[PDB]
Design a protein around this ligand. Structure first.
Ligand SMILES: [K+]
Ligand SMILES: [Mg+2]
Ligand SMILES: [Mg+2]
Ligand SMILES: [Mg+2]
Ligand SMILES: [Mg+2]
Ligand SMILES: [Mg+2]
Ligand SMILES: [Mg+2]
Ligand SMILES: [Mg+2]
Ligand SMILES: [Mg+2]
Ligand SMILES: [Mg+2]
Ligand SMILES: [Mg+2]
Ligand SMILES: [Mg+2]
Ligand SMILES: [Mg+2]
Ligand SMILES: [Mg+2]
Ligand SMILES: [Mg+2]
Ligand SMILES: [Mg+2]
Ligand SMILES: [Mg+2]
Ligand SMILES: [Mg+2]
Ligand SMILES: [Mg+2]
Ligand SMILES: [Mg+2]
Ligand SMILES: [Mg+2]
Ligand SMILES: [Mg+2]
Ligand SMILES: [Mg+2]
Ligand SMILES: [Mg+2]
Ligand SMILES: [Mg+2]
Ligand SMILES: [Mg+2]
Ligand SMILES: [Mg+2]
Ligand SMILES: [Mg+2]
Ligand SMILES: [Mg+2]
Ligand SMILES: [Mg+2]
Ligand SMILES: [Mg+2]
Ligand SMILES: [Mg+2]
Ligand SMILES: [Mg+2]
Ligand SMILES: [Mg+2]
Ligand SMILES: [Mg+2]
Ligand SMILES: [Mg+2]
Ligand SMILES: [Mg+2]
Ligand SMILES: [Mg+2]
Ligand SMILES: [Mg+2]
Ligand SMILES: [Mg+2]
Ligand SMILES: [Mg+2]
Ligand SMILES: [Mg+2]
Ligand SMILES: [Mg+2]
Lengths: 185, 159, 58, 172, 183
RNA sequence: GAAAUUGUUGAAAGGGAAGGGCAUUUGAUCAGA
RNA sequence: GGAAUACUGCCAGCUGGGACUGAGGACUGCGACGUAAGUCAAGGAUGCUGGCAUAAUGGUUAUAUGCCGCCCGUCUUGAAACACGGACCAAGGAGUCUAACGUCUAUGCGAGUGUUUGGGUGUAAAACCCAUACGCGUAAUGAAAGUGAACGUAGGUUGGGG
RNA sequence: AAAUAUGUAAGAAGUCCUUGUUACUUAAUUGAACGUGGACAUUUGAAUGAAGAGCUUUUAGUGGGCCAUUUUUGGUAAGCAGAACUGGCGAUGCGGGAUGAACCGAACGUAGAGUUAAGGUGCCGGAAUACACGCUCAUCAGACACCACAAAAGGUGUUAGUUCAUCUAGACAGCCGGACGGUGGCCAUGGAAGUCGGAAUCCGCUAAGGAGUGUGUAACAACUCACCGGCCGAAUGAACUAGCCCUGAAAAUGGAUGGCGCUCAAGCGUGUUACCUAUACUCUACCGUCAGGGUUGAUAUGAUGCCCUGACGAGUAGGCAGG
RNA sequence: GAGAACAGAAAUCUCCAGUAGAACAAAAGGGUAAAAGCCCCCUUGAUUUUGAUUUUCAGUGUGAAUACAAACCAUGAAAGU
RNA sequence: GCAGUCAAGCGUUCAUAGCGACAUUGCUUUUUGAUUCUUCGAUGUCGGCUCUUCCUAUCAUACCGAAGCAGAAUUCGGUAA
RNA sequence: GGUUGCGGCCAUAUCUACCAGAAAGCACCGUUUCCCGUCCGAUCAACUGUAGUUAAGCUGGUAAGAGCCUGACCGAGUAGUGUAGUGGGUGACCAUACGCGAAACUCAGGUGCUGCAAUCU
């Protein structure tokens, strides 16, 4: 017998391959597994880990987010890497010329980048251009902007978006939500 | 029925330290508490206002707020399987400055001075405390100290 | 039929299975219960400090 | 406890700045090894003086060998022991060739006759009785008569085999 | 040390030997029915299995741990021969959280070289003489997995104190015989 | 044309149940090389 | 006074007998001996020899022998229970589908999304194509009237992968 | 006023130096908070450890408990009823306690070898009818904790002790002799003379003899004993103490140190070795799980592939995964 | 305790001693002596606004309480409360 | 319910022939309680009749010890179911 | 060093009984028109510092003083207590092992220290 100080046979708790059966995603995973194993560049390892992420862990990165990241001092000529979908954003009226590497581009996002004079490239094209992630800028979309997230941690005095089907007057607003009916929260 | 009041079971906790009853001496009110100061909580039974709950007697916390006659103290309370942040509004008669870090601050100053004198004289610092070490070898003389032989004593009652 | 009334048996074991976790101290703690007069003046002090530091970055 | 050895144990009641060179107390302890000897020394020092192992130190432990291990001696042994209902002092006389052998015999005899375990016995004193007629116990006095001879009737020889073919004899 | 004892005796003094700086502790009790505080102390001394042993540098902080776990361990002062045989036969290093046998000096150099330990004998020296890097060397050493004693425990019952005819507690110099029979 | 249940034949065992586990003896039978 | 011996301990001292194991499968390494060739007990067994070539080993099965072995299911703190169901066998026999939903995951598109109410079409309940709407989302808040999201490089400080 | 338990601190989110903001505060650039700038990494300021840490979501079952040591309440008590801490059983097999949920030991993948735990070694039954010192004879002996009961009080049974005494100037026991005088001491009593009783405890002669140790009388008397002698000649007496044994000790079918049986034990107390064996420890092999890695440079068709390394494996309710 | 007509053993007056052996609404515990007790003077902070916090606790509610803020007041010479 | 230990007293005198206070130690499960462990998909719930066996804390019978046993009768106790 | 005003710690400072106190200070002390308060100028208020005194307050000393404070190889490693055993004991309880460790008692010492400011033979 052994007095175990930790749980035995505990899985790492992190994905080691995508849950997806996309053959092209599996090929990209293979390429970046090779790169992460035989380059020692942290960019390749983080891209390989990002390729495993689920959909809610790969929020879309808008072109406006890419432009704001490129407005960083010294990042104007860096290749923007988004392991996920790049979406369009009509709220920004001036997009700069740049190279964006992403898993997927929305038609509008690709059109905006091309019209601004840049290129939309795949992750294997990015690997060929910069095998060690030279001059790269990894961008991640807002994870906690999800609709599901605001209901997380619901409870007294949390302010955490009760799970409700219809909203308005008569829908969970009287007893426990205001001092005039019993108490507020 | 059962009885769990605010001051239940505080009969000896909140007593006045026999032959130390009456008015609180003025050093308690002349003490100065800044935000971040570490204070020990000990309720004064003669001051019924701003009194801590019995759970916080003997608890040590950090001041987060300073008011006219009271300070706010942050206490980490064990509730279930985790600690919850509690904020107590305690009058200064129920707290005192904690000496749990006076030794640490003096050690900090002494370590700074020792480090400066080390980097001025040579290369040696040894700025970490060490536990009590095993004693080294020593020679014990018998000059004027010849060993006296003892024996266990026989039983007797002497009552 | 009478039953058991109370016991703390196994409660410490349950609490220590997931452990008693210290409450994750942060720098810049919350100013929830801080004296509102101090908070009101602190807001103006920080605003003036920010404006001074912005104007002095030449 | 086991086959005994005798140790002198000298301890110090560790010096301070006010009292350097403390009084260096000594004991003769019968024990099977030095760990037990030191433990017994500290036990009796805690029974006698205001000191404990944490506030004292062992200055010296030395095995004391029998001066004449091949000379037959009469020993008088003063012991104190705890019975089931009280504490009593006893004086016994043991004939042996060494203090350690006499003490082993004493522990065996106390266990046999009074059910006194090792933990319940304090050896107050073991001293050789130099002069006969100061031996006061008949079970030792009977072994000091001039030209003492005695037979060993009914000898029982141990058989190396399960079966014997001779109907053996107990002559001697 | 021998000559200091002889000279003190010749001068009529007593040479009090320096208190031992090193102990070897072997867990002699199973993993069942251990109170939480002694169980935690055993885990922090890496005795998570019966007949597992570790070296402990003696201070007040570790002496109180030994006091807490006394009824479940046999500990004492290991000799050079005991330490050498332990490291030679059952010496394993913790390398990348793995138990790797110390079959070559290159392993010891690659894992303890930054502390000036180049060989298995350098490791043994750092253990026996409690050096500046004793903590790192001892923690690099995987807890020794000893067998049961080959001639038995020498007592009918293990779980009373060594002073009381048992096996646990401080058996100061006899730990060498116990560990050798266990190795 | 199953099983429960039954007859005959053949084999085997059987001092107040039978059945089972590990191991091998003996009898019968059999694969692989 | 000089030893010896006991006891305890040490030797990187020598050596005999017994048992179990032989995993791995070109080389790579660390060593030892040897001046060097090379050899080796040095990152896991090889060498020589004999009998058999089949029920001999072995498997299966029946029996015998040694030791062990309470009747399953269930409720229960506790079942072999003098607690309940079960004489036996075959077949049937118990978390299903739907409406609306939470989390998570996969897929398509993405500030948009949903062709399939319906229309067109068809090799005719399939497949293919489609307008206007509608639903949800892109704005919230207030009981409501109502109002409605950039001082700033959409802020400062701290940590932050890259 | 302890012990145990318990709060806090042991640094870079620190320390030190200079001075910017404020509508707060001060008599006052006084202080408070937040700052800009500058200096200090070998031990960045105790020990030990760290199959890493932190974080989030969503869901099953459960919400009758019970037992053991210790603390403890009610109750005479309970295999009762209720609390505290811990460890367990439930949910757990394995070796031991004959047998048993909880005790001891130890927790479990499939095997081999070795060593042990608790417990044992007369035979059942693997292992010394081993060694050593003693104790016990039971016409109800005794024989390993939990646990399957026994007490007060007793015993010239036997063993070992404590204390106080007597003794060659003659002890104890034993046999024989004396055991007197004042005196029927003073008092109710009907009678009371040493011996129904109250008080008084003397003196003499003494080697010695109580104003009497008992039998006895109505009272006497008569015997007897304390006390002293004669004989003998070396040890003896008393009160206690506690070991084993015995008495105390009585229930119902016939039966239980587990059985047989065991008596310088195969019982009891103690000590020393040797030996036996768990699914426990050590080493190795194989299976699987987890973790860390190597390997798309091809003939390499199995990169969820091949390979290397280390550790781990109990399980009801229940969850998930691969089949 | 010592003193004064009725007036003693209890009436009113005086002094001394008096660490609280009294009193503070109530049960008990704690607290309190130039007071928290007794007497006197003035008053309505037993007011308004909405937050924070402690106990019970799920860190929900309710009750009770704590410390502030923004007003208006009371009291005192004032600090303050 | 039954049995002990002490022994102030009863027993004309005399503790213990027979008793025995004030106390105290036990045994038994033929009383009644206490508890709720077994049984509520069911152990037939009083008493009597009949019949067998077991226990001894023995009423009688056998043999005895003791007495406030002269005999007779009786009482206490032992081996004994 | 004395004294005063304000104090800090709050008896080593308190309590009882005597003794002493130069200078200054403090104090008692003298008066009732005014402000003010009482049954009472006793308290409180005001006025004088003049008429007097160290009697008291106050300060210090004394006492095998009471109390209080400190220390102790004093009691005592005792009581108690954490951990351990298939330890003892019918039990009640007790012993032992590894640790922690009192209180009473006894003895010895001591009897305010000190800050700011002013003033004094
Ligand atoms: K029933
Ligand atoms: Mg395992
Ligand atoms: Mg207190
Ligand atoms: Mg109040
Ligand atoms: Mg319940
Ligand atoms: Mg062996
Ligand atoms: Mg054993
Ligand atoms: Mg047919
Ligand atoms: Mg059939
Ligand atoms: Mg038959
Ligand atoms: Mg030798
Ligand atoms: Mg065969
Ligand atoms: Mg069986
Ligand atoms: Mg039940
Ligand atoms: Mg069952
Ligand atoms: Mg039954
Ligand atoms: Mg049922
Ligand atoms: Mg049925
Ligand atoms: Mg079927
Ligand atoms: Mg239920
Ligand atoms: Mg119950
Ligand atoms: Mg259950
Ligand atoms: Mg178990
Ligand atoms: Mg049994
Ligand atoms: Mg045998
Ligand atoms: Mg007795
Ligand atoms: Mg007469
Ligand atoms: Mg008996
Ligand atoms: Mg036997
Ligand atoms: Mg024996
Ligand atoms: Mg095995
Ligand atoms: Mg892997
Ligand atoms: Mg499993
Ligand atoms: Mg007042
Ligand atoms: Mg309430
Ligand atoms: Mg029926
Ligand atoms: Mg029936
Ligand atoms: Mg009878
Ligand atoms: Mg006047
Ligand atoms: Mg006045
Ligand atoms: Mg005077
Ligand atoms: Mg005095
Ligand atoms: Mg145990």
């Amino acid at each position: 017998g052994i007095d175990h100080t930790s749980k035995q046979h505990k899985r790492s708790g992190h994905r080691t391959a995508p849950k997806s059966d996309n053959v092209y995603l599996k090929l990209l995973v293979k390429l970046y597994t090779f790169l992460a194993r035989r380059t020692d560049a942290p960019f390749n390892k983080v891209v390989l880990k990002a390729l495993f992420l689920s959909k809610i862990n790969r929020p879309p990165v808008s072109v406006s987010r890419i432009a704001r990241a490129l407005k960083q001092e010294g990042a104007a000529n860096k290749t923007v890497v988004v392991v996920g979908t790049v979406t369009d954003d009509a709220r920004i009226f001036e997009f700069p010329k740049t190279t964006v590497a992403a898993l997927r581009f929305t038609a509008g996002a690709r059109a905006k980048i091309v019209k601004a004079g840049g290129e939309c490239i795949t992750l294997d094209q990015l690997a060929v251009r910069a095998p060690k992630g030279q001059n790269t800028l990894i961008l991640r979309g807002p994870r906690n902007s999800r609709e599901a997230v605001r209901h997380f941690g619901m409870g007294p005095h949390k302010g955490k978006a009760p799970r409700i089907l219809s909203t308005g007057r008569k829908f969970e607003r009287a007893r426990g939500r205001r001092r005039s009916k019993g108490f507020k929260v | 029925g059962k009885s769990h009041g605010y001051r239940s079971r505080t009969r000896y906790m909140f007593q006045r330290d026999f032959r130390k009853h009456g008015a609180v001496h003025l050093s308690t009110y002349l003490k100065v508490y800044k935000v971040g100061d570490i204070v020990d909580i000990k309720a004064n039974g003669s001051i019924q206002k701003g009194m801590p709950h019995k759970f916080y007697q003997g608890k040590t916390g950090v001041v987060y707020n300073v008011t006219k006659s009271s300070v706010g103290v942050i206490i980490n309370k064990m509730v279930g399987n985790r600690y919850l942040e509690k904020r107590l509004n305690l009058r200064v008669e129920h707290i005192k400055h904690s000496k749990c870090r006076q030794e640490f601050l003096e050690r900090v100053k002494a370590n700074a001075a020792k480090r400066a004198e080390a980097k001025a004289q040579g290369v040696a610092v040894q700025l970490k405390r060490q536990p009590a070490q095993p004693r080294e070898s020593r020679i014990v003389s018998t000059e004027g100290n010849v060993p006296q032989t003892l024996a266990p004593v026989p039983y007797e009652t002497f009552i | 039929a009478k039953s058991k009334n109370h016991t703390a048996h196994n409660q410490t074991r349950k609490a220590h299975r997931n452990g008693i976790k210290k409450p994750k101290t942060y720098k810049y703690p919350s100013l929830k219960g801080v004296d509102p007069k101090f908070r009101r003046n602190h807001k103006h002090a920080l605003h003036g400090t920010a404006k001074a530091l912005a104007a002095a970055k030449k | 406890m086991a086959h005994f050895k005798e140790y002198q144990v000298i301890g110090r009641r560790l010096p301070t700045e006010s009292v350097p060179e403390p009084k260096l107390f000594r004991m003769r302890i019968f024990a099977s090894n030095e760990v037990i000897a030191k433990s017994r020394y500290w036990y009796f020092l805690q029974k006698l003086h205001k000191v404990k192992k944490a506030s004292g130190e062992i200055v010296s432990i030395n095995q004391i060998n029998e001066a004449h291990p091949t000379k037959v001696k009469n020993f008088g042994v003063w012991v104190r022991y705890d019975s089931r209902s009280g504490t009593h002092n006893m004086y016994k006389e043991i004939r042996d060739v060494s203090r350690v052998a006499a003490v082993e015999t004493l522990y065996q005899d106390m266990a046999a006759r009074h059910r006194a375990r090792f933990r319940s016995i304090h050896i107050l004193k073991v001293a050789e009785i130099e002069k006969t007629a100061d031996v006061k116990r008949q079970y030792v006095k009977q072994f000091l008569t001039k030209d003492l001879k005695f037979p060993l009737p009914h000898r029982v020889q141990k058989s190396t085999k399960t079966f014997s073919y001779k109907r053996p004899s107990t002559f001697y | 040390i021998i000559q200091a004892k002889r000279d003190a005796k010749a001068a009529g003094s007593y040479y009090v030997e320096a208190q031992h700086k090193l102990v070897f502790v072997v867990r002699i009790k199973g993993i069942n029915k251990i109170p939480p505080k002694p169980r935690k102390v055993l885990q922090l001394l890496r005795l998570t299995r019966i007949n597992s042993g570790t070296f402990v540098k003696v201070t007040k902080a570790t002496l109180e741990l030994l006091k807490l776990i006394e009824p479940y361990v046999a500990y004492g002062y290991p000799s050079y021969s005991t330490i050498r045989q332990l490291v030679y036969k059952r010496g394993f290093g913790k390398i990348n959280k793995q138990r790797v046998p110390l079959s070559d000096n290159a392993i010891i150099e690659a894992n303890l070289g930054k502390y000036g330990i180049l060989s298995i004998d350098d490791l043994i020296h750092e253990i026996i003489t409690v050096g500046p890097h004793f903590k790192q060397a001892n923690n690099f050493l995987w807890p020794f997995k000893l067998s049961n004693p080959s001639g038995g425990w020498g007592v009918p019952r293990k779980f009373k104190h060594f002073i009381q005819g048992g096996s646990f507690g401080n058996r100061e110099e006899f730990i060498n015989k116990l560990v050798k029979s266990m190795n």
